[PDB]
C-alpha cells in the first residue's frame, strides 16, 4: 500500500487474502478433526470413569489388564490417569480334575468350583483359589447316574 | 512429495514452491502421523498376548475339531484354511506418491492369531488375565455354560451332540462365507477407496487448472519467463489444493480406521480373551467363545452362540 | 431414403495407444441409432450436401464406382475447394479456387473450365466390400478415417483409423460425390448423366459433439463403444 | 540433514524422513523423423538459364523441410544480406511459404535490390517491400552468361509511367508515351521502347558483368506452417534414465525394449493413469517402454545424540542395486547396520518386520520378536489351580479437554 | 450439482469447469457415500429385531 498504486495493488491484496484464507481454512479443518478426536477420547474416558471408578465391571481389559477390583482417578492439566487395582493369580499348581463323582449309583456335580485331586484324595475348590474341602452335600448336587 | 508432485523436474518451480511456505512440512508430517497410527492400530488387537502359545501335538480336545482354524503344516505359510480362504478372496512408480508396507507382515499377524487361538482353546480366559492355566476343553465349555446360567449337567451329558453341532457349524461357515461374494466387503471397500483416491490424485495432473498445458516444460518452452510464471502458478495452486483435499480425506479415513480398530480391539479383548455378559457385542445371542482370524487388512471374529429352541408351553406360578 | 446406423461411426479420437482400459472422451462422433440419409435411387437431381461437422461416407460399391470427392465452400469463382481424385494406383489431392459445375464427373480429367491451384497433396491412393470413411476438419487439419471391411450396415463393430491428415483449413460447406459410368458422357459443363451399371449408393450422416466411452483391449484396438445420451444404461 | 529437517540440535531416537533420492540423467537424447522432402533450392540457385529482371522468375516453396545450409555449397557471393532475420538462426524457425525470385542484373545495380533504395532496377522492374523480412543473395555469373558477340537475350525495363508496387510484375511491350504526341506503335521522337537489352560480354569489368540475384521471402500467414528447418537427431540409450524428446514427447526415464506391438497410425501410449508408458522410435520401427529409474525416500535411523552419533540410512521402496553393510529388506534397503539373526524386542520400527537398535557398538537390524515361547501341556485329566494372589496397579492415561483457541 | 451451482445456465462456464478434473466427481461420490451411510445408520438400531 506504499510502493504500488491502488488500482494495481488490488490484485496483489486479493491474492494475499486468498492465500491467507486458504491457509486458515485448512487450520480450521485440522482443528475440527482434532476436536472430534478429543471428543471421542473424552467420551471413552468418561465411560471408563463411570464403569471403573463408580463401580466394578466384569469386562476383561476395560478397567485394567486382568481382574478389575477398583479404580482411582487422578487429574492432569489436559487429561485423567486411572489407577486400576488388579487381582492376579500366581503360584499355580498341577492337580487332577474330573467332571463329576459317581457314588451310590448317582453322578453328583459340584455347585461352585471343581473337584481337585492330589493322589488318592478328592476335594472341592473354587476356580480362583486353592481351598481343599471335603465333598459334602452342601457343595454338590445329584443330576442322574454316570451312564 | 510436493517437490516432485507439484514440480516435475524443475528448479525454478521448486524455488517458487518454497516461497509458498511450509505446507509440505506439515503435509508430510500428518502423513507420517497417519502411518504411525496405522502401524500402532495393528498392535492393540493382535499383540495383546505377551507370550506365544502353541497347540498340543495330540489333536483330540474332547470331541471337537479345530482343523479349519488351526494352522496347516502342509502349506508353507502358517495359516488356517479359513485364513487361506479369506486371503484368496480380498483383491488387493509415480510422480512422487509412494506406498510404505506395514511393519507386521501377514506372517506375524498369523502367529499372533495362532497364539490367541491356542490361549483361548487350551487355557480359556486365564491367558489374558495373568499366567496361563491348563484346563480341558469340555471343562472350559462347562465353565462358559455355567457363566450364563445354564447348568453344567446338560454339557457333561449331551457332550457328543454339542461337539457334532460345533463341527457342523465350523464346516458350514466356510460354505456360508463362500456363497455370498459380498461377505468381505468391509475389507475390500477400504482398499478400493485408497486405490481410487491414489488413481485420482495421479490422474488430476493432466488437468489444465486453467493454464494452457499441464506439463511445465511445454509452458516454459512456448512462452516467455515473464508470461510463463503465472501459468505455472495456476498449476502449483491447483496441485496444492488437490493435495490438501487428499490429505484431509486421508485424515478423515484414518480417524475412521482408528475408531474401527479400537472397536475391534475392544471386541477382541472382551470376546476372545474371556466371556462377556453383553447382548450383541460378542455375537447375536448367548456368547460362549470367539475365535479370531487374520486378514490382510482386518480381523474376522467367529463367535460361538448357544441358542435355545423347541420351546413348549407350561404353567408358571 | 433414410436408414439407421445401429453401431457404426466410431474412430480413434487420438493417436495414442491404450491396453485393456476404458477411455471416455468428448469428441465429434455419429450418434448410434440415428437417421442417416441413404441415397441409392439418385443416379446423378443431385444437390450438394453441407459439411457442417464432417461426413460419414459408407460405400458398398461393386468395383471402382467412386472416383473421388469434392469439398468446397460455395463452388464459385475464387473459392478454395479441396478435390481428391483416386486413380488406379495414384491419388491426387489439390485445393483449387476454380468454379465447379453442378455434377463434376471423371471420364480424362476434365471437371470444369476454370483452373487455379494453390496447394497440392498427392500421396498413396486411398481406395462384402464395405468401405467406410469419416471426413472431418478441426484445428485447420482436414482428417480422413478409412476402413475396408467385408459384410447395408451390419450389427458388427469396426473402428476407423486416421490414415491421412492434411494441414489446410477451409470453411468447407459443400460435399460432392463422383460416380463412374461407361456411356462416355463428356462434361464441358454438363448437368446430367446416367448409365446402366452396378448398384450406386452413397450414405450421408452428420456428426455431432458427443462423449464416447471406448474400450481398448490388449492389442490396442477399439472393440466396444458406448454413447452417453442414447439409453439410461449407456 | 536430520537436524536441519527437524530444526533442532538434540534429535531423539527413531527414524526420521529428511529428503528424497533422485537419480539425475547423464545425457539427453532427441530423436525426430527422417528428413526426406528437401525443398528444391538446388534448382533455383544452380539452374540452367535465368530469366530477365522485369520477368523475374518466381517459385513458391511449401510442404517441404527447407535446409538453409545447402545455400552455402559454393561461396564467392558478396551480397548474402538478410533483412529482418539473422543468417545463422534461419534453421530455428518455420514459415508457411517461401517465395524465391531470381533475376539477372548488372554489377552496379546489385545494391538497388534492397528495401527503401531506389534507382533504375527497383523502380519499374522488381521492387522490394519496405518491411521485407527475407534474404537477398547475389553472385557473379560471367562465365555462364557472357558471349563474345554479345548476350542480348536479357531485357530490362527503363521507362514507365509510375513506379511499381511491392512484388509486382509488368510484362507490357507498349511504347512509352513520353510527350503529348500520341504514339502509334512506332518508335521515334517522344515514343521510345521501354524494354532495352543487355550487352553482356566477357570484356566487361566488375560492375557491368551479369550478376544473378535471388530473393527468398518468408510468409508466415495464419495458416499452419509446413516448412520447418532440418531437425537434429542423436543415439539411443539403454539401461539408463536419460532425457528423451521423441517427436515432441519430452520426458525423463529409461527406454527399454519390450513387446508392445503398436498400430501403424499411433506413436506413443498412455497407461491407465494417463501417464506415458511406451513410445515408438522415430527412426526404427521398434517400441520402447519408459521406466522410472531408482527413486524413493531416504530416512535416517538415528539413536539420538544422547547415546552416540552413528546413524544409518534407509532407502524406502527402491532396490539398492544401483547408487556400511548393505542389506535388502522387503520394506526397502538399509545401509550402516548389520543384519542380526537373533530376534530381540523391537525398538525402532523400519517395516516388513525389521527393527533397529543399538547393541552396545553400532546400529543393528533384526526381525522383531512377537514374544516368548510357552507351550502348556493340554490334558483331559489335569488342571492348574492358583495358590497365591497379587495386587497390582495399572496406569491408564486418557486426554479429556483441549486448548481453547480462537483467531 | 456442480453444473448448476458454479456454471448455472452457462455452457462456456461448464466447459471451463470440465478442465478442472474429477473434483466434482469425487465430491458427488462423497455425498452419495454420506447419503448411503446415513440411510444405513437407521437400520443398525431400529432394525435389530
Ligand atoms: C545368517 C546366519 O546363518 N548367520 C549369521 C552370520 O552369517 C552373520 O555373519 C552374523 C552377523 O553377526 O549373524 C548370523
Ligand atoms: C504341570 O506339569 C507340566 C508337565 O510336567 C509342567 O510343564 C508344568 O510346569 C506343571 N505345572 C506346574 C504349576 O508346576
Ligand atoms: C492331598 O491333600 C490333602 C489335604 O491336606 C492331604 O490330607 C493328603 O494327604 C494329600 N494327599 C497326599 C497323597 O499327600
Ligand atoms: C476334522 O475335519 C477334517 C476335515 O473334515 C478331517 O480331515 C479331520 O480328520 C477331522 N479331525 C478330527 C479330529 O475329527
Ligand atoms: C402356546 O400357546 C399359544 C396359544 O395357543 C400358541 O400360539 C403357541 O404356539 C404355544 N406354544 C408352543 C411352543 O406350542
Ligand atoms: C428419418 O427422417 C425421415 C424424413 O424426415 C422420416 O420419414 C423417417 O421416419 C426418419 N427415420 C427415423 C428412424 O427417425
Ligand atoms: C491416373 O492413374 C494412373 C495409373 O496409376 C496414374 O499413373 C496417374 O498418375 C493418375 N493420374 C491422376 C491425375 O490421378
Ligand atoms: C531413416 O533413414 C535411415 C537410414 O537411411 C533408415 O535406416 C531408417 O529406416 C529411416 N527411417 C524411416 C522412418 O524411414
Ligand atoms: C539423556 O540421557 C540422560 C541419562 O539417562 C537422561 O537423564 C536424559 O533425560 C536423556 N535426554 C533425552 C533427551 O533423552
Ligand atoms: C533387488 O534386486 C535383486 C537383484 O536382482 C533381487 O534379487 C531382489 O529380489 C530385488 N529386490 C526387490 C525388492 O525388488
Residue numbers in the entry:
A (entry chain A): 981 to 1127
B (entry chain C): 737 to 828, 854 to 1078
C (entry chain C): 27 to 70, 80 to 142, 157 to 176, 187 to 210, 215 to 297
D (entry chain A): 298 to 620, 640 to 676, 690 to 736
E (entry chain B): 737 to 785
Question: What text appears in the publication on this structure?
Answer:
The trimeric spike protein is a major membrane surface glycoprotein of SARS-CoV-2 that mediates the binding to the host receptor ACE2 and subsequent viral entry into cells. The matured spike protein contains two subunits: an ACE2-binding S1 subunit and a membrane-fusion S2 subunit. Extensive structures of the spike trimer reveal the open and closed conformations for the three RBDs within the spike trimer, where the open “up” RBD conformation is prerequisite for ACE2 binding. Upon ACE2 binding, the spike trimer undergoes conformational changes to expose the FP motif of the S2 subunit to initiate membrane fusion that allows the release of the viral genome into host cells.
To our surprise, we found that mouse ACE2 bound to both Omicron BA.1 and BA.2 spike trimer with high affinity, but no binding to WT spike trimer. Moreover, mouse ACE2 binds to the Omicron BA.2 spike trimer with approximately threefold increased affinity (KD = 2.9 ± 0.2 nM) over the Omicron BA.1 spike trimer (KD = 9.1 ± 7.1 nM). To reveal the molecular basis for the high affinity binding of the Omicron BA.2 and BA.1 spike trimer to mouse ACE2, we determined their complex structures. Two major states were observed for both BA.2-mACE2 and BA.1-mACE2 complexes, in which the spike trimer binds to one or two mACE2. In the first state, one RBD is in the open up position with mACE2 binding, and the other two RBDs are in the close down conformation without mACE2 binding. We observed similar RBD-RBD interactions in all mACE2 complexes with the spike trimer of BA.1 and BA.2, which is consistent with the similar interaction in Omicron spike trimer-hACE2 complexes.
